[PDB]
């Protein structure tokens, strides 16, 4: 009842390997800018002032 090694390879099912994994699907990617965005005294989102 045991056929062979070579025809045993021909009865396996090849699974499609996908290049370009595609993690950009359903991803929204909000734009994170360089300067640290903070809140001023009126509550608006402003960058940091140029003082330390």
């Amino acid at each position: 009842d045991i056929p062979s090694l070579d025809k045993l390879v021909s009865e396996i099912k090849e699974v499609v390997i996908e290049e370009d994994d595609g993690l950009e699907e359903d991803f929204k990617a909000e734009a994170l800018s360089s300067e640290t965005v903070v809140l001023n005294e009126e509550g608006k989102s402003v960058p940091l002032p140029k003082k330390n």
């Binding site: 640290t36 903070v38 809140l39 005294e41 009126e42 509550g43 940091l48 002032p49 003082k51 330390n52």
Partner: protein, 99 residues
């Protein structure tokens, strides 16, 4: 007789002078020209040392909120207290000053 109960005071709020100085500098007639300490979404460092900054103001800050100092180093509002905010610093604390 009636002044025996006032001969030594009793109060909480170790930063007592910071709340008085936010009420007396507007009583100066010259410093009502929007000489205002920002306290709603901004704050001043009271103490800083070994990675913990105590920050006056920040009355609208959330617990666990990422705050940013003027130096550029960021922090986290850890202890929201009745008169200050305890901030753990996410960098070197040598670039943070009082004020």
């Amino acid at each position: 007789k009636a002044l025996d109960e006032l001969r030594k005071p009793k109060f909480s709020s170790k930063y007592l002078i910071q709340h008085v100085s936010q009420k007396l500098i507007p009583a100066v007639k010259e410093w009502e020209k929007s000489y205002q300490p920002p306290v709603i979404h901004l704050g001043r460092v009271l103490s800083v040392g070994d990675g913990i900054a105590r920050v006056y103001g920040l009355k609208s800050v959330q617990a666990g909120e990422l705050v940013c100092f003027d130096s550029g180093v960021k922090g986290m509002a850890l202890n929201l207290q009745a008169d200050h905010v305890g901030v753990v610093v996410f960098g070197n604390d040598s670039v943070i000053h009082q004020g």
